[PDB]
Amino acid sequence: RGSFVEMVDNLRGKSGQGYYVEMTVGSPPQTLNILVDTGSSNFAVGAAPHPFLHRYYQRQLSSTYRDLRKGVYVPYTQGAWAGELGTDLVSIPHGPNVTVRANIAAITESDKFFINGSNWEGILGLAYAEIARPDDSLEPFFDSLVKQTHVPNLFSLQLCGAVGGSMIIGGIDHSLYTGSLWYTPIRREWYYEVIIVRVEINGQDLKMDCKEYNYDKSIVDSGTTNLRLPKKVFEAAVKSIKAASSTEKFPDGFWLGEQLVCWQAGTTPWNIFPVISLYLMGEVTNQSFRITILPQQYLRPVESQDDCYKFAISQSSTGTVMGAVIMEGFYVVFDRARKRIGFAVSACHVHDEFRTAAVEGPFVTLDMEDCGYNI
Numbered sequence: 001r002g003s004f005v006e007m008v009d010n011l012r013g014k015s016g017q018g019y020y021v022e023m024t025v026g027s028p029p030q031t032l033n034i035l036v037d038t039g040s041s042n043f044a045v046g047a048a049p050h051p052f053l054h055r056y057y058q059r060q061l062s063s064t065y066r067d068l069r070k071g072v073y074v075p076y077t078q079g080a081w082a083g084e085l086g087t088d089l090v091s092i093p094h095g096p097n098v099t100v101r102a103n104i105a106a107i108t109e110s111d112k113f114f115i116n117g118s119n120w121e122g123i124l125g126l127a128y129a130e131i132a133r134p135d136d137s138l139e140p141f142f143d144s145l146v147k148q149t150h151v152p153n154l155f156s157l158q159l160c161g162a163v164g165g166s167m168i169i170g171g172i173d174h175s176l177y178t179g180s181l182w183y184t185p186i187r188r189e190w191y192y193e194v195i196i197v198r199v200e201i202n203g204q205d206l207k208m209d210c211k212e213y214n215y216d217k218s219i220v221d222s223g224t225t226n227l228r229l230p231k232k233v234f235e236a237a238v239k240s241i242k243a244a245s246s247t248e249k250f251p252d253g254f255w256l257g258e259q260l261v262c263w264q265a266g267t268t269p270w271n272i273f274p275v276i277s278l279y280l281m282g283e284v285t286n287q288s289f290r291i292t293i294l295p296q297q298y299l300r301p302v303e304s305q306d307d308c309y310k311f312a313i314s315q316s317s318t319g320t321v322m323g324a325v326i327m328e329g330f331y332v333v334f335d336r337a338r339k340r341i342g343f344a345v346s347a348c349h350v351h352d353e354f355r356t357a358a359v360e361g362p363f364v365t366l367d368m369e370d371c372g373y374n375i
């Protein structure tokens, strides 16, 4: 036991359909399972019956609920919901030892948002006010917590793939990683926006201009499953990954996410697939570092004696998104007080006897401030 021990192992997931934490709302208490999302900024909960929900928030039974008299609507890349704004008291039983009064949206209708069998009933948006709906005067959950209490302006995340993990609020826990932590600056506070300066596939540089990697932004996002890439980058990376795994051919639909391939239980040939590295901007002029993932991170199991996989890198038209495929390799620190994000090798990542995920540096990279996109 270190001093954050009671927060270790406070996350669950069912069949790889989102990581969630327990939260307690209102008075007397109602406890619900809440999806953790660093790619949005609204706190919202289901508040009316739905065939995919086991329970929901009942405002009439809470004596501390206050009505803001205002509607709200939120569309994502996948799905959308509409509801009503209010405030109420909120705690996290396996989190920090405080209670705050927070904005909450009560979800009364939705389309392709809730997921059958996921076991979660609402979402906690952990990013900044600039992207909240209906606009930036609606204060997000993490801002309320820092402004009302002593808790330090920092949190960190360890997602353990195949489903559990930990969310540490107000500090770092040294048993959750090995080796050192390496930091990249947050470019601007809206999404958690970062700069990628080089890409390699099995040690071989892809050689695109670095402005293509960040067009029109690159972000770190725990509520999206895949690594998503801009059109011209997706096309050149798949060509290179096929060239490097050519001891077995696969149909074209596999690299598009439209076909699965299944091996007999225990026998998947991890070694025929290459490793992938991203280089990120560091904290000193002209210095970078690199993070490296394995096929165990970018091929995802779909839930007999047969192990079936889907290829989890895909095309985007709104910039690079480092989703759960990147985060399951690493312990990640969202250090909001010093405007930076830290990466270290995770103590729980999935690997084999020949290779492991890695975080290494320092490397020399010139002109990194050219790489970023301006409106």
Ligand SMILES: CCOC(=O)c1cnn(C[C@H](O)[C@H](Cc2ccccc2)NC(=O)c2cc(C(=O)N[C@H](C)c3ccc(F)cc3)cc(N(C)S(C)(=O)=O)c2)c1
Pocket: 016, 017, 018, 019, 035, 037, 038, 039, 040, 041, 074, 075, 076, 077, 078, 079, 113, 123, 131, 132, 133, 221, 222, 223, 224, 225, 226, 228, 314, 323, 324
């Ligand atoms: C308002 C200001 O913000 C925005 O405008 C805005 C617009 N988009 N966002 C990004 C947010 O983070 C939303 C939140 C959300 C959360 C839940 C449901 C719907 C939306 N995520 C997605 O949009 C999204 C979700 C999934 C998915 O399946 N997730 C499950 C929970 C999951 C499963 C396993 C895991 F390990 C981790 C997560 C797949 C895709 N893909 C497109 S994919 C196939 O990965 O390429 C996209 C913010």
